[PDB]
């Protein structure tokens, strides 16, 4: 992938671990400087704040909506359901807002599929989402100064929220 892919993989992993911990155990089954590990946690914290202040993508509210709609997810189609949400979310392009919204979705979706009794469901959702960051969004992330840049972006949002 792009420049510094190896470090970004590890940092994307840390951001996801921190993000899912802060918002949701069931979704699971080094090489970083203490700097990069700290920037990952800070980014997951700001993003959690942005999500909570954005009712359209709030984690709990979306799990409630997925259940009310009877979203037909099974062990057989759950990846293709996830991939369709991914395709539509970024079909117009990629920016930090759609990244935040997609990651919020991925936590709501992981909780939802785990509530549907899909064994390994949330773990698979976590791993798919981590690899969207690694493989499809990496060029955007690095272009916008990585997770350090996200914190600058998110602070600006929270000032405005």
């Amino acid at each position: 992938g792009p420049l510094g892919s190896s470090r970004l993989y590890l940092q994307n992993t840390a951001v996801m671990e921190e993000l899912y911990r802060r918002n949701l155990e069931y979704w699971r089954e080094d090489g970083l400087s203490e700097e990069e590990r700290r920037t990952a946690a800070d980014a997951a914290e700001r993003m959690t704040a942005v999500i909570a202040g954005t009712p359209g993508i709030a984690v709990e509210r979306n799990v409630r909506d997925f259940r009310r709609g009877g979203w037909d997810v099974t062990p057989d189609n759950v990846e293709s359901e996830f991939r369709e949400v991914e395709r539509r979310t970024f079909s117009d392009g990629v920016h930090w807002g759609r990244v935040i919204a997609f990651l919020a979705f991925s936590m709501s979706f992981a909780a939802y599929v785990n509530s549907r009794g899909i064994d390994g469901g949330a773990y698979s959702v976590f791993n798919w989402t981590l690899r969207v960051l690694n493989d499809s969004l990496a060029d955007f992330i690095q272009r916008e100064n990585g997770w350090r840049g996200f914190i600058v972006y998110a602070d600006t949002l929270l000032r405005a929220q």
Partner: peptide, 25 residues
């Protein structure tokens, strides 16, 4: 895929746009 998946993705695109608009004031 389900209608729900396409509609969820579409709404994530739009809410993401609203989130990003706040960066530019």
């Amino acid at each position: 895929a389900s209608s729900m998946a396409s509609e969820v993705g579409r709404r994530l695109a739009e809410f993401g746009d609203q989130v990003d608009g706040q960066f530019y004031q």
